[PDB]
Amino acid sequence: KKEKRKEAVKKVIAAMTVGKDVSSLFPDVVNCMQTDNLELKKLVYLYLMNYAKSQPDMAIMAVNSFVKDCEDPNPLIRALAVRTMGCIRVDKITEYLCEPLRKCLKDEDPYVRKTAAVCVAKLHDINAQMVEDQGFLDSLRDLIADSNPMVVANAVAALSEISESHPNSNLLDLNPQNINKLLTALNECTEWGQIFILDCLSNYNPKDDREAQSICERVTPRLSHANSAVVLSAVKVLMKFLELLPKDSDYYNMLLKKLAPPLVTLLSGEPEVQYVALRNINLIVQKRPEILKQEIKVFFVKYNDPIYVKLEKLDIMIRLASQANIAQVLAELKEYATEVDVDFVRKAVRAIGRCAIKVEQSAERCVSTLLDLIQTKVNYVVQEAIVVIRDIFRKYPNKYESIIATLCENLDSLDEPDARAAMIWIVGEYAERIDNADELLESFLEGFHDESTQVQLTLLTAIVKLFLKKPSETQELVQQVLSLATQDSDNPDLRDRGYIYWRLLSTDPVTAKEVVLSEKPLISEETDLIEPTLLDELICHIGSLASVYHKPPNAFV
């Protein structure tokens, strides 16, 4: 009858997985848990999981069965019972789980100990406020030193999860000679164990240069094949340990020369690992520039990469482009110019301008290739080109002013709001030379509403500039945007800036001329950098999602 019971249990589990509610058959499954075959008990426990993880409440009655099963001699069933008892998030789970867990931590089986450590981390998530939680935390630290690597990996993961609470505690771990134990674990652990223990070790601090050098020398060889997880954690812990002075022993130069090749090889895995590794090497390059100094050739995006990998490869390529690599970068961007993909081609043509701003030696070549690329007469290409030339003018003034004419030759359609803002700004700033500036800005003042706020704001600033450059003729148009954006518009930022300009023009026009039309400083090769302190704290979180999102962990949890 055992085979028939097992078949019935499997059918019930399949029916529950289908979606229908089988809570009526719960007592039969609960009674069936008292068997001897491991497969039958395991299949019952999966059925109990199906209810427990999603909505625990109907499986609370099996506490006595769990306690009875926890004394079984086979480690598989014992660990399964411990995990099952811990999996239910109920108030009374602690009372029935604390007593078995203490004996479980000393179980003569590595698998039982690993499941017990995961259960401790699970119990610390819900209802961990008494001294029992502190006692288990103290016992876990002793458990870290163990022969099995699975148990030490899972205990380190449990400690990392527990350390979210910070009641003036030094992460409830670390000690003298304990780092040696952690490295010994790295010697014989698995890939995931290496990831866990290394992410934990990255939260330590070095006391002396010798200890930091020893730790760095011990960690570098562990460049495994777990995709960009173990390697990324290794580079995180290496760069977080960059306490070696530049004027010191020939290890820092050795460290960089040994770190660059493995970091180049991350761009060889699956596209998702490609994306994460690309964002992370973006952050690393922005922080330390002398790593990927002469390895640009790997970032040239081919036809086998998806859209996000393409875009981030262009971003990092712009970051790494210098005067010595202008030829290859511009040739490859000219190749990118005909890649059909709208977002990719916009990014590629904006790369030609960001590189031109970045590298002042080849501005002429960048402008030449920009012109040849505009001659394509494609609407989105020309719009991104006018944005790029707006960016270039702010960097090089009164040198490339003639180009707007040969770009306006192909402006049949203007629909990108960034392009509209660029054209409006270009007309407004150079309003003492463009004779048709008044006509243009009067033409733009028809559909002022139903426009993006940036376009409205740039148009308002351009109109006030045009008034301040040609006060006599157009003092009937500035009052057509200062009474159409300051009264008829609900945009507190826009409205308050409109009053700011209105009061400047009506209080002291000399100060108005000296403020709005002031000689603005140049862009100064701004390559979209990150604030230094944000970069410094993101270097401490290379592996985590903080690097992929480029935001500190406090901004999202």
Binding site: K10, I13, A14, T17, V18, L38, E39, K42, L43, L46, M49, N50, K53, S54, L76, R83, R89, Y111, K114, T115, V118, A121, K122, D125, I126, M150, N154, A157, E161, T190, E191, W192, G193, I195, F196, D199, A226, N227, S228, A229, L232, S233, E270, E272, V273, Y275, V276, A277, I307, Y308, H541, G543, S544, L545, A546, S547, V548, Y549, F556, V557
Partner: protein, 393 residues
């Protein structure tokens, strides 16, 4: 560290789900479904930050894997774990498909429990996890006398199958069972190996020389056919049954003076072949004295000895219609007759297998004479009989 895990199809239906964190609920499921399954113009990106909850996703064929997280997870660890999980599933039950996941729920749940607990992706080695999993997945991709010689190649292949059914008078089927027996005669010379190709579509005493060790792969059957007529085996298929005929009896007790009965037979097999000897027996209450029957097809008579109306059809094609309407004279009686509610019984024979069993291939190879299998010229005839085929009325 991993806050959950979901698997989506092309239409966004959640085939499996396993939630580890307390924070992630059905809101995250709806979030991911709406924000990637129903994407309109957003740029594709594997990790998305929505409602302060991360959403890693890896696309494999027509299956969407989502590893929802609500923490500062090691970003590439989730991708490495997802790839390791895909490799493990490839090792266990091969390529990922709708049927595989729909049929291996227990295997998937056990695999997730073993590889993953509370969000930490523990060891995923195939050899290490092989001993830790007890469930196995399901993948869906005669002695003769010496010197027996026959001058004429005569071979019989009769698919005799019995169909039984009892449907509700409203038209709902309640129970049906089939008892099928295969009888064949083999007038062959030498000792050849004969291959019998057939679509099982069902899992099933067999002959001494019949071995069913490799019957799982299509048919893959090899046997030595003894001379003379014999029974192959007994089988019963219920999942795939093609009812040959349907009867919808519309009776009406219009008072006690007369009784109105209306039975319709609606053939629902292929019109290319014609059923033979269609017999319908309509029971009649015992209070009858004289009745008149009108039939659109064939002829009918009244059998007072059997107290029933006999209806016979010479032959009809598939998807045809036939009307039998009988005016039943009813005696006044006293009370408590109720006609006992007798079922409508029919008997017939059709030239096709009621279960739809069609022979796929028949290859004969003779090691001694070495004649081609195509040289065996034989035509197959089917005799699909009917058992106690009664429809309640």
């Amino acid at each position: 560290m991993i806050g959950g895990l979901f698997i989506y199809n092309h239409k966004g239906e959640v085939l499996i789900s396993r939630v580890y964190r307390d924070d992630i609920g059905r809101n995250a499921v709806d979030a991911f479904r709406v924000n990637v399954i129903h994407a309109r113009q957003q740029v594709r990106s594997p990790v998305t930050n929505i409602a302060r909850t991360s959403f890693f996703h890896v696309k494999r064929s027509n299956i969407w894997l989502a590893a929802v997280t609500k923490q500062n997870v090691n970003a590439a660890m989730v991708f490495e774990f997802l790839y390791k999980m895909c490799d493990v599933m490839a090792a266990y039950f091969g390529k990922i498909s709708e049927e595989n996941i729909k049929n291996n729920f227990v295997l998937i749940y056990e695999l997730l429990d073993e590889i993953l607990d509370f969000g930490y992706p523990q060891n995923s080695e195939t050899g290490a996890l092989k001993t830790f999993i007890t469930q196995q997945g399901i993948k869906s991709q005669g002695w003769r006398r010496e010197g027996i010689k026959y001058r004429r190649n005569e071979l019989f292949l009769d698919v005799l199958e019995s169909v039984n059914l009892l449907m509700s008078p409203q038209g709902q089927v309640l129970s049906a069972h089939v008892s099928g027996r295969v009888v064949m005669k083999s007038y062959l010379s030498g000792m050849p190996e004969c291959k019998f190709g057939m679509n099982d579509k069902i899992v099933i005493t067999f002959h001494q020389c019949v071995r069913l060790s490799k019957f799982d792969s299509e048919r893959s059957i090899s046997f030595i056919p003894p001379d003379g007529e014999f029974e192959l085996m007994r089988y019963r298929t219920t999942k795939d049954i093609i009812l040959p005929f349907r009867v919808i009896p519309l009776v009406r007790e219009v008072g006690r003076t007369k009784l109105e009965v209306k039975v319709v037979i609606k053939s629902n097999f292929k019109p290319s072949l014609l059923a033979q000897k269609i017999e319908v027996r309509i029971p009649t209450p015992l209070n009858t004295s004289g009745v008149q029957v009108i039939c659109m097809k064939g002829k009918a008579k009244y059998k007072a000895s059997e107290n029933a109306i006999v209806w016979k059809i010479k032959r009809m094609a598939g998807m045809k219609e036939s009307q039998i309407s009988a005016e039943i004279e009813l005696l006044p009686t006293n009370d408590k007759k109720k006609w006992a509610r007798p079922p409508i019984s029919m008997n017939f024979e059709v030239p096709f297998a009621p279960s739809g069993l069609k022979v796929r291939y028949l290859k004969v190879f003779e090691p001694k004479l070495n004649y081609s299998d195509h040289d065996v010229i034989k035509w197959v005839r089917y005799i699909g009989r009917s058992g106690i085929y009664e429809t309640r009325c």
